[PDB]
């Protein structure tokens, strides 16, 4: 029941007694600060402290709770900013809820699932067309700093507006004023009222960074097991991994590659497998995961990147070269993968995207001939003209996610050759005015894609685009 502290240092306390304590049990110090039993040793209990430790000393007493760590869950957390313990940080009162869930919770088994068949639209043309994410899938967003990782997750969250999908943005190890900037961006785009924000900033103790993704996962699981659909973002697991390394090294567990312990893979695999697509018997709900990894100088073969790449169902690789050139979002399509693939797309997108991935592969493969202008044969001439125009369609502005019906028409137009006549610099303006024309006048073609999930009459669609093309003025 009760035990006394032997030694204290660096957010860690070793405790005498507590003979019947569980591994992972919640503990309470005499001043009200909480702790978690990580190491059970022969003569002491290694406890990680979930708060300040300056008032914890030798002779300080610790109490058993007899419980694992739980968090508040449900509709009350929507629109709120919380820490990993579920305590509010936004300064907008308490979180009234009867529903609670454990931080550590087992993932759905092999028989509890159904194949991922439902789209989770990011609203980003490059991702939705060629690297499609499905409901229940785990898709890694990976790349160096300032490549556009966070923006992709925020634009995905904004695009869920009016789609009945609860979003969860987990911030781990970030500057707290940067997190304050993120919630303001969600507020301005009307995205916050269906979003839960879990933040464990850089000044927080290491156990809260370690526990932040699991806390956010539990909040997403509530909606999954109730039959609804949810999205969780871990931004990022690199800083979470480093926080768990800190605690393991302080508890003197043996170091390996980059000083990480032997259970750091187990850490992330246990987290990410809880994201799933449930079967009809289990209610049919889902949790989609978007884990982040911050690589260093493009080193995808570093240890923590290697772990999370293999665990997930696919990777959206971002790169600095593309970002600086103006290809934004800076998605490397060649190496990026989605193992779910066509199953996560509607029939309209699946049909148009086949030519898009073919055309874009041949362009960047035959880009050595690009400087040699007008010396080439007409076969490779038109493919370069087509290729550079499709790149301009795959470019997209910040915080402007496109509906799937508008994406497929834009991809249909460029791939079938309706923008070959228009110059390269006017392709993005041609897109914006075309979709404005289609929304106002030819809404029946758009509404067909919304309702059926298929392309309308192709010759009717060709006629609609050609009417606009005559009204357009190049430059």
């Amino acid at each position: 029941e009760v035990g006394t502290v032997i030694q204290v240092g660096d957010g860690i306390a070793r405790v005498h007694g507590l003979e019947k304590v569980m591994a992972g049990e919640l503990l309470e110090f005499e001043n009200g600060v909480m702790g978690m039993a990580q190491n059970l040793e022969e003569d002491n209990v290694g406890v990680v402290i979930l708060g300040p430790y300056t008032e914890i000393r030798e002779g300080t007493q610790v109490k058993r709770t007899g419980r694992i760590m739980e968090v508040p869950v449900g509709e009350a957390l929507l629109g709120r900013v919380v820490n990993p313990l579920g305590q509010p940080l936004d300064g907008r009162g308490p979180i009234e809820t009867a529903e609670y869930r454990p931080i550590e919770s087992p993932a759905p088994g092999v028989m509890d699932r159904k194949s991922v068949h439902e789209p989770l639209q990011t609203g980003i043309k490059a991702i939705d067309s060629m690297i499609p994410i499905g409901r229940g899938q785990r898709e890694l967003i990976i790349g160096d700093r300032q490549t556009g990782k966070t923006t992709i997750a925020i634009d995905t969250i904004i695009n869920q507006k009016g789609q009945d999908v609860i979003c969860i943005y987990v911030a781990i190890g970030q500057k707290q004023s940067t997190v304050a900037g993120v919630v303001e961006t969600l507020r301005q785009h009307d995205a916050l009222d269906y979003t839960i924000v879990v933040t464990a900033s850089a000044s927080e103790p290491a156990p809260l960074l370690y526990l932040a993704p699991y806390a956010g996962c539990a909040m997403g699981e509530y909606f999954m097991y109730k039959g609804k659909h949810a999205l969780v973002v871990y931004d990022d697991l690199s800083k979470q991994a480093a926080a768990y390394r800190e605690l393991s090294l302080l508890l003197r567990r043996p170091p390996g590659r980059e000083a990480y312990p032997g259970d750091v893979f187990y850490l992330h695999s246990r987290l990410l497998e809880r994201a799933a697509k449930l079967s009809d018997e289990k209610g049919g709900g889902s949790l989609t995961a978007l884990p982040f990894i911050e690589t260093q100088a493009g080193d995808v073969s570093a240890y923590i990147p290697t772990n999370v790449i293999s665990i997930t169902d696919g990777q959206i690789f971002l790169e600095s070269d593309l970002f600086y050139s103006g290809v934004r979002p800076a998605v490397n399509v060649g190496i990026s993968v989605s193992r779910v693939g066509g199953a996560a797309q509607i029939k309209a997108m699946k049909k148009v995207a086949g030519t898009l991935r073919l055309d874009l592969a041949q362009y960047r493969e035959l880009q050595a001939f690009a400087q040699f202008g007008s010396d080439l044969d007409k076969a490779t001439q038109a493919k370069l003209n087509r290729g550079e125009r499709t790149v301009e369609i795959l470019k997209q502005d910040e915080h402007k996610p496109m509906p799937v019906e508008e994406q497929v028409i834009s991809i249909y137009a460029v791939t079938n050759g309706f923008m070959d006549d228009i110059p390269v610099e006017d392709v993005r303006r041609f897109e914006e005015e075309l979709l404005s024309f289609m929304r106002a006048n030819k809404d029946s073609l758009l509404d067909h894609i919304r309702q059926t999930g298929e392309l309308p009459d192709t010759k009717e669609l060709d006629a609609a685009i050609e009417e606009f093309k005559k009204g357009f003025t190049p430059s």
Partner: protein, 462 residues
């Protein structure tokens, strides 16, 4: 039997103290009753002294308490074997995870054991006829051999695995085992249903060591599948198949266990027992006098470096490679096996005949020449090629289409019924194309057929 107390719990490691003179052997399964229901199994690893045994956990250690009773089972992790395992999905401990009722096997065998003795082993290489033209001709599998399976996402890896299970079961009467080392739970569910739909479920026992299990579980799961494959070889004399996906994740698990036990790392951060662990797994996969286990193994290559200790140690045991290419799948050439990149140790006049080797090398030389001229043809044109090359290009295109084949498992995709083509028919078919007997036939005739007679039969319909 021996009973002990938990003295330490440190992540997936558990130290258990036993009474004097009655300790568990190394690699023994030790069961611990959980306070909140269920049973944790741990594996004995090190004898530290003072009658204390350090153990590696096969499941989560959360909820454990110091002082709980731990029972020595008296043997390693013992798993069910025989026909009761067929059509079922298992974990590392040999327990069913498919929720499909009881597994009524007669025997349970330990997953830890020595490799077969020198006197038991086969003394000569024998081909394992898969019935797949491209594999049998150009990169044939050996009985008791190990094959490296390479290929990207969505190129026909799972379809090829299912066809090998079907063909060996149908013609040779050899059953199969699938070992998912670091299996993604979503993909394990898909693979189960995919094997149900194709019908090869009944010829295969499945074992998953899932991604979200501890390093100890993923380390020993290949041994569980291996033990099931060994029963059918040793007892029923079968030429068994053993699929291991991914063999790197077996090595990865060993490195993780080694780090937990506190061993000094070796080169490139790998465990010092790298070769020993790989060898003790791989040597059990072999051809005996009674039967064999042939293993198709998916291999991840870290940093695309084949000199890295993990793939380098794995390649020491491989007898062949099946390299799937995406460009062939895009052309419609299924199975999408790269006929130049795929290789085999047993492609020689000693193992297969003199004719087989001559025809196989002729196919390679023709396809290599066609591959070299792709840049010349694309720019300069067909008139640039000499009269010798024009004929080689024509035969290479016929050869490339005759290497394709309709699969029993892929009847839904192709539409046509599947074909098993014997080695003699495969050798004869490609021989006749190289000799120039079928130069006047159209190229569509050679596409998606079994024997050379079916190509001639298709020509009249075109």
């Amino acid at each position: 039997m021996n009973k002990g107390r938990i003295i330490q719990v440190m992540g997936p490691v558990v130290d258990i103290q036993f009474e004097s003179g009655q300790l568990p052997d190394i690699y023994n399964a030790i069961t611990i009753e959980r306070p909140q229901g269920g049973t944790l199994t741990v594996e004995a690893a090190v004898h530290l002294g003072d009658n204390v045994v350090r153990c590696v956990a096969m499941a989560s250690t959360d909820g454990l308490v110091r002082g709980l009773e731990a029972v020595d089972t008296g043997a390693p992790i013992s798993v069910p074997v025989g026909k009761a395992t067929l059509g079922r999905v298992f974990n590392v401990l040999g327990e069913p995870i498919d929720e499909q009722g009881e597994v009524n096997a007669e025997e349970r065998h330990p997953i830890h054991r020595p490799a077969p003795e020198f006197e038991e082993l086969s003394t000569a290489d024998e081909i394992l006829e898969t019935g797949i033209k491209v594999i049998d001709l150009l990169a044939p599998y050996a009985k008791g051999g190990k094959i490296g399976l390479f290929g990207g996402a969505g190129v026909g890896k799972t379809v090829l695995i299912q066809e090998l299970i079907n063909n060996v079961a149908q013609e040779h009467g050899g059953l199969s085992v699938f070992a998912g080392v670091g299996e993604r739970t979503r993909e394990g569910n898909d693979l189960y249903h995919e094997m149900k739909d194709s019908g090869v479920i009944s010829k295969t026992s499945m074992v998953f060591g899932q991604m979200n299990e501890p390093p100890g579980a993923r380390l020993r799961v290949a041994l569980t599948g291996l033990t099931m494959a060994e029963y059918f070889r040793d007892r029923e004399g079968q030429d068994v198949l053993l699929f291991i996906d991914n063999i790197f994740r077996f090595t990865q698990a060993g490195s993780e266990v080694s780090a937990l036990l506190g061993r000094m790392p070796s080169a490139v951060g790998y465990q010092p027992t790298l070769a020993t662990e790989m060898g003790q797994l791989q040597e059990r996969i072999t051809s005996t006098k009674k039967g064999s286990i042939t293993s198709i193994q998916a291999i991840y290559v870290p940093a695309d470096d084949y000199t890295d200790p993990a793939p380098a140690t794995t390649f020491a045991h491989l007898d062949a490679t099946t390299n799937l290419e995406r460009k062939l799948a895009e052309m419609g050439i299924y199975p999408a096996v790269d006929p130049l990149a795929s290789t085999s140790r047993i492609l020689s006049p000693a193992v297969v005949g003199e004719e087989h080797y001559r025809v196989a090398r002729g196919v390679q030389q023709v396809l290599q020449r066609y591959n070299d001229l792709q840049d010349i043809i694309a720019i300069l044109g067909m008139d640039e090629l000499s009269d010798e090359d024009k004929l080689i290009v024509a035969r290479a295109r016929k050869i490339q289409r005759f290497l394709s084949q309709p699969f029993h498992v892929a009847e839904q995709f192709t539409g046509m019924p599947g074909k098993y083509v014997p080695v003699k028919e495969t050798v004869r078919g490609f021989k006749e194309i190289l000799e120039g007997k079928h130069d006047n036939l159209p190229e569509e005739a050679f596409y998606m057929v079994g024997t050379i007679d079916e190509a001639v039969e298709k020509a009249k319909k075109l």
